[PDB]
Structures are given as C-alpha cells and as structure tokens.
Design goal:
Elements (H helix, E strand, L loop, with lengths): L2 H9 L2 E8 L5 E4 L5 E2 L4 H12 L8 E2 L21 E2 H11 L2 H10 L2 H11 L25 E2 L1 H12 L6 H12 L17 E8 L5 E8 L6 E8 L9 H14 L4
Antiparallel strand pairs: 1-2, 1-9, 3-6, 4-5, 7-8, 8-9
Helix pairs in contact: 1-8, 2-4, 2-6, 2-7, 3-4
PDB class: hydrolase
Keywords: beta-lactamase, fluorophore, biosensor, hydrolase, Antibiotic resistance, Cell membrane, Lipoprotein, Membrane, Palmitate
Assembly: monomeric
Length: 259
C-alpha cells in the first residue's frame, strides 16, 4: 500500500495494481492508471473478441501457415506447420502456452490491432491501445503508449468478457477453462493466492523488465476477484523477477481479507 512501495523498493521496479472483489465491490489500486506494455496479457482479450465474432462451430475452421510466420520460440504452432491448426486449437495454444504465432493468426482472423481496438472501445475500454501485430518483435521504448494498457483497464476488460455480458455463457466458459488451465503462470498470481482456490490467468513479459499477470481468482465459496499485477523497470534490458508478482498478489489478498 505501502507494502506495495516496499515491494517496489525490494525489487527496484514499478508496480501497477488493480483488484476488484466482485462479492463486496472492494477495490485494491496502486498506480492503477499507470501505463505498461501489455505484452501477452493481450492474448486473453484477443480470444474474447474472437469468441464474440465466431460460433463455437466456427472455431473448427482450419488456419494454414508456414515456418515463415513463426519467429523465435512458438511451442505449439511449430509442431503443426504441415497441417495448420483450427481456431480452437490456436486459442488454446495462445492462452495456455502464450504461443506468439497462434496469437498472430487469431489477431489476423479478427481484423488486426485496429479491429481489436475498435471492439475494446466498444466495451468501454478507452485505455487499452493495440497498434501492432506481434509487437513482441519491436524495440518498444518508454513513454510510448502503443501496445499499452493499465491495471484498471485490463481488469475491467477481462471482467467484461470473462464474467459479465460481452460473451454468451457457453463461450465465457471456453475462455475461463483455457485461462484456468494456463501453463505459464505458476510463479506469478497463482503463487500468491491461498492453496485450493481456483485461478484463471494470462501472463506476459516484454522488455524494460516488463512482467505482467492478469487473473480471476475464486475463493471456495464466494464470488471471484479479478486482478491485474503489472510491472516494469528502468533499463531496457532489466531482468524481471516472478517473485515480485507473487508478493504483490499476497498484499492484495491481505487487503481483500482474502477474496
């Protein structure tokens, strides 16, 4: 709070925090409106819009691609160049493996960053600014607002798709299932929540030591909490530490008296 400034002290980083307890409407905010590169947290929002646009049957449509649409590491999509993959399999890979090439294919399907912004603006997210495909591949420098969001806007938008009415119940269920089954976030929000409690999350990292996680957290009984923990550092090549995110989550949970 305070403990938040202490974490920033301990990790030499800047935190961005917003949490909403949907049970009591309690809010926890630390630089909630400070901008960070959203990095792969955008993959969650991109699937929300894909689901909005496509019937569940339409997710069976096959997308073909070549090795030249893959750059650096893409753990799922490098396995299926020969066959291509369905939209459903791409959403799975994007969300649970943070597959860059799968995210790009999905983004292309929905009409690119311009169309994603349009749809975000349509759900009343006036802050999230998608501008580039695969922004991962660009040397993005500080003070730029392209491909940034805030902890507050990311919670509001994740909540809108995952928990409110921007998606019908069966599609909301797909989004939640994929995020619950994420493989990349064990040391982040998940490491900061009490044992047992279900977590659905999407992680991201960039440069300037950017390390992000956005989540929905269910207490065993009671309504969920939606949370964004964003972080960055002063130097372009700064290392991040996952533990910062785990510890910031602990402070949120304390403040929420849990849940």
């Amino acid at each position: 709070k305070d403990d938040f400034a202490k974490l920033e002290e301990q990790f030499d980083a800047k935190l961005g925090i917003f949490a909403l307890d949907t049970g009591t409407n309690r809010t926890v905010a630390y630089r909630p409106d400070e901008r960070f590169a959203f990095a792969s947290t955008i993959k969650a929002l991109t699937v929300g819009v894909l689901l909005q646009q496509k019937s569940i049957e339409d997710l069976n449509q096959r997308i073909t691609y070549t090795r030249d649409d893959l750059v650096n590491y893409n753990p799922i999509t490098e396995k299926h160049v020969d066959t291509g993959m369905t939209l459903k399999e791409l959403a799975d890979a994007s969300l649970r493996y943070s597959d860059n090439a799968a995210q790009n294919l999905i983004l292309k399907q929905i009409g690119g960053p311009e169309s994603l912004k349009k749809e975000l603006r349509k759900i009343g997210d006036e802050v999230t600014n998608p501008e580039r495909f695969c922004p991962e591949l660009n040397e993005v420098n500080p003070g730029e607002t392209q491909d940034t969001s805030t902890a507050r806007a990311l919670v509001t938008s994740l909540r809108a798709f995952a928990l409110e009415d921007k998606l019908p119940s069966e599609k909301r269920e797909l989004l939640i299932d994929w995020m619950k089954r994420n493989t990349t976030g064990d040391a982040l929000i998940r490491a900061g929540v009490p044992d047992g409690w279900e977590v659905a999350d999407k992680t991201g990292a960039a440069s300037y030591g950017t390390r992000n996680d956005i989540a929905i957290i269910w207490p065993p009984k009671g309504d969920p909490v939606v949370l964004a923990v964003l972080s960055s550092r002063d130097k372009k090549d700064a290392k991040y530490d996952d533990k910062l995110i785990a510890e910031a989550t602990k402070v949120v949970m304390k403040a929420l008296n849990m849940n």
